[PDB]
Design a protein around this nucleic acid. Structure first.
Length: 145
DNA sequence: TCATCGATTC
DNA sequence: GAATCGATGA
C-alpha cells in the first residue's frame, strides 16, 4: 500500500512514502522512522530524494511537518512549514549536509506545538512540495532513481 | 496494535 | 551535534 524509495542500484529501501495531495499541498510524504527498524533508511532515502531533485533542476522546496500529532495540534499550515522562509534551498552543499539542515528544523516541534530550544527526534513524517509540480510522474522518477 | 518524539547512545 | 532506541498514549 505504501510506495518506497529505491537506491542507486534499484534496491528497495526501508523507507515508505506516498505521492499526492495532503492538506491542499501536492508532493511526497516520507513516513517517520520508528520504533526500531520501521523505516530505518529514512535519512538515506531523504539524501537520495535531495540528490535527485537537484539533478532534475529543482533548487528549492517547501517542507511541512506532517505527523499525526502536529496535524492535530497545529492547525495552521504556515506553522507546520518547518523552515522559516518561504522555501528551503537544496543546492550549495552535499545532499547529506542539506538533509542535516532540513531535518534539524524538525527538532523545533513537539507533539503539541513549537519549542524554543530544539531537541529530540528528527526523522518525522514530512511533506515535500516542489512549487509548480502537481504530477505523480515527476515524483515517481525521484523515488525510483 | 500503532506512529509518536523524548531519551539514550553514537 | 546526530543516529538510533524504545516508552508512551491513543
Amino acid at each position: 500500500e505504501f510506495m518506497h524509495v529505491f537506491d542507486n542500484n534499484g534496491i528497495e529501501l526501508k523507507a515508505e512514502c506516498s505521492i499526492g495531495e495532503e492538506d491542499g499541498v501536492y508532493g511526497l510524504i516520507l513516513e517517520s522512522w520508528g520504533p526500531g527498524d520501521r523505516n530505518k533508511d529514512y535519512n538515506i532515502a531523504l539524501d537520495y530524494i535531495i540528490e535527485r531533485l537537484v539533478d532534475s533542476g529543482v533548487s528549492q522546496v517547501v517542507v511541512y511537518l506532517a505527523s499525526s500529532s502536529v496535524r492535530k495540534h497545529m492547525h495552521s499550515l504556515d506553522e507546520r512549514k518547518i523552515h522559516p522562509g518561504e522555501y528551503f534551498t537544496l543546492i550549495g552543499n552535499s545532499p547529506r549536509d542539506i538533509r542535516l539542515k532540513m531535518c534539524g528544523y524538525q527538532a523545533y516541534f513537539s507533539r503539541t506545538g513549537r519549542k524554543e530550544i530544539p531537541s529530540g527526534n528528527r526523522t518525522k513524517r514530512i511533506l515535500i512540495n516542489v512549487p509548480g509540480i502537481y504530477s505523480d510522474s515527476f515524483w515517481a522518477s525521484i523515488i525510483r532513481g
